């Protein structure tokens, strides 16, 4: 009686890939933001999270669902951005641990690179369903764009030189995946999603292929991800970062992976001075489709259902530890037991 339309969960998708492959730029094109331009050195140094309500995903896939026949079943999707720079393997591992499905970004002009291989191992270890965004197609020489088009509609319009270049680069990337033990196919040439990795060509600059990628991730959620993860179960939450925010004191940014968090909840998490026990005074999200990791305006909530990226204002968070689990003390819980439990992992 819990696997039904009244208990749906928004799943979590991680975007992984080698440095400078376009992971942040793809998310900026989806959000209609400019986070990448605001990063020092254009380098992502923190895990990001953006929530997409299913209404926005429907709109942003309309050009590859013109007849309206694709059935959306998820309520929304939380997408996690991760660093590609070699020095952030800990945050790729943390992000991957949180996700239920993933996009692996490959620059079509460079193929598989060391952090591509690292990310592929993280996904395989957790049996995470994924597709590959073969990004930067606009760098094919003579590429002719239509902004935000479906990949097939745009590829049909390309000259013979571009089609040959695309095919050569696609074949090279397929060979590299096979050398790593993965069979792969262009996503409309793929007979089986499970058997072979789907490859979806994209441009974060023109937006082409992004509708196809969004449709594919929704299909991964509804068709490949364990069905139990489409529905809410016990609370799971993880601290990402500790940030002082004007008006809200020292706050924490948290991925709520499962269950429901409520304003007023008694929470326990790891701290530098020992376990922190406190009460949520404000339970915040960014606006839809805006990054948790960028300071902005916030929406206040009495409750937030998973999965979401939230900011919590509460007394006593100064020494909160990134990576900590976060537990909610229920009526029959022993608070000291919960303390021992967050510090045990």
Ligand X SMILES: Nc1nc2c(ncn2[C@@H]2O[C@H](COP(=O)(O)OP(=O)(O)OP(O)(O)=S)[C@@H](O)[C@H]2O)c(=O)[nH]1
DSSP code, position 325: B
Does 24 interact with Mg ion (rule: CB under 5 A)?
yes
**Rounded CA gap, 290 and 253, in Å?**
14
Handedness of CA 160, 26, 9, 240 (dihedral sign): positive
Q: Of 20, 138, 165, 339, which lies in the binding site for Na ion, with binding defined by CB under 5 A? A: 20
Complex with Na ion: residue 42 or 264, whichever CB lies closer: 42
Are 260 and 280 contacting, i.e. CB atoms less than 8 angstroms apart? no
322 binds, among Na ion, Mg ion, ligand X, none (CB under 5 to 8 A by kind): none
Does 190 interact with Mg ion (rule: CB under 5 A)?
no
- Tell the smallest beta-carbon distance from residue 337 to Mg ion (Å): 40
Residues in contact with Mg ion, shown as a per-residue x/- string from 34 to 63 under the rule CB under 5 A: ----------x-------------------
Complex with Na ion: residue 82 or 206, whichever CB lies closer: 82
Complex with ligand X: residue 51 or 88, whichever CB lies closer: 88
Token readout for 214 is: 């969004």
For the range 89-95, what are the long-range contacts, defined as Cβ-Cβ under 8 Å and sequence gap of 24 or more? 89/118, 91/46, 91/47, 92/16, 92/118, 92/119, 92/122, 93/122, 94/47, 94/238, 94/323, 95/14, 95/16, 95/47
Does 114 interact with Na ion (rule: CB under 5 A)?
no
139 binds, among ligand X, Na ion, Mg ion, none (CB under 5 to 8 A by kind): ligand X
Complex with Mg ion: residue 41 or 68, whichever CB lies closer: 41
Give the residue among 21, 31, 23 at the shortest CA–CA distance from 286.
Answer: 31
Complex with ligand X: residue 137 or 326, whichever CB lies closer: 137
Give the residue among 238, 232, 280, 285 at the shortest CA–CA distance from 258.
Answer: 232
**Rounded CA gap, 61 and 69, in Å?**
12
- Tell the smallest beta-carbon distance from residue 73 to ligand X (Å): 29
Residues that bind ligand X (CB under 6 A): 17, 19-25, 36, 42-44, 83-85, 135-136, 138-139, 203-205
**Rounded CA gap, 338 and 344, in Å?**
10
Site for Na ion in 32-91 (CB under 5 A): 42
Are 95 and 119 contacting, i.e. CB atoms less than 8 angstroms apart? no
Complex with Mg ion: residue 23 or 311, whichever CB lies closer: 23
Complex with Mg ion: residue 44 or 128, whichever CB lies closer: 44
Q: With contacts defined by CB under 5 A, name the span among 7-15, 23-31, 94-102, 127-135 that binds Mg ion.
A: 23-31
Token readout for 127 is: 């049996």
Handedness of CA 309, 311, 312, 317 (dihedral sign): positive
- Tell the smallest beta-carbon distance from residue 44 to Na ion (Å): 6
Residues in contact with Mg ion, shown as a per-residue x/- string from 214 to 253 under the rule CB under 5 A: ----------------------------------------
Complex with Na ion: residue 20 or 208, whichever CB lies closer: 20
Are 276 and 320 contacting, i.e. CB atoms less than 8 angstroms apart? yes
* Radius of gyration, alpha carbons of the chain: 20
25 binds, among ligand X, Mg ion, Na ion, none (CB under 5 to 8 A by kind): ligand X
Q: Which residues contact 319 (CB under 8 A, 6 or more apart)?
A: 242, 271, 272, 273, 276
Nearest residue to Na ion, using CB? 42
- Write out the residues near Mg ion by the rule CB under 5 A: 23-24, 44
- Write out the residues near Na ion by the rule CB under 5 A: 20, 42
């Amino acid at each position: 009686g819990h696997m039904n339309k009244d208990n749906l969960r928004s799943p979590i998708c991680c975007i992984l890939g080698h440095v400078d492959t376009g992971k942040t730029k793809l998310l900026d094109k989806i959000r209609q933001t400019n986070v990448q331009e605001g990063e020092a050195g254009g380098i992502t140094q923190q895990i990001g999270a953006t929530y997409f309500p299913v209404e926005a995903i429907k709109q942003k896939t309309a050009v590859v669902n013109k007849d309206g026949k694709f059935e959306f079943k998820v309520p929304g999707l939380l997408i996690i951005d991760t660093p590609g720079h070699e020095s952030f393997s800990n945050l790729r591992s943390r992000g991957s641990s949180l996700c239920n499905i993933a996009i692996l970004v490959v620059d079509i002009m460079h193929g598989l690179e060391p952090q591509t291989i690292e990310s592929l191992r993280l996904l395989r270890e957790r049996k995470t369903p994924f597709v590959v965004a073969l990004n930067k197609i606009d760098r094919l020489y003579g590429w002719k764009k239509i902004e935000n088009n479906g990949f097939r509609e745009s590829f049909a319009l390309q000259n013979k030189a571009v089609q040959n270049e695309f095919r050569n680069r696609l074949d090279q990337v397929k060979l590299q995946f096979a050398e790593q033990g993965f069979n792969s196919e262009l996503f409309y040439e793929n007979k089986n999603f499970a058997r072979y990795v789907s490859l979806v060509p994209t441009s974060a600059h023109t937006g082409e292929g992004i509708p196809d990628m969004l449709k594919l991730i929704v299909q991964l959620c509804q068709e490949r991800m364990a069905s139990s993860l489409m529905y809410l179960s016990e609370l799971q939450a993880t601290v990402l970062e500790v940030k002082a925010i004007e008006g809200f004191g020292v706050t924490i940014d948290v991925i709520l992976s499962n269950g429901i968090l409520r304003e007023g909840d008694r929470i326990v998490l790891c701290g530098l001075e020992g376990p922190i026990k406190t009460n949520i005074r404000a339970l915040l999200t960014p606006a839809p489709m805006r990054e948790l990791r960028i300071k902005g305006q916030y929406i206040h909530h009495k409750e937030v259902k998973a999965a979401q990226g939230v900011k919590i204002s509460a007394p006593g968070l100064e020494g909160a530890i990134a990576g900590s689990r976060l537990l909610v003390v229920g009526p029959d819980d022993d608070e000291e037991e919960l303390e021992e439990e967050v510090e045990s992992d």
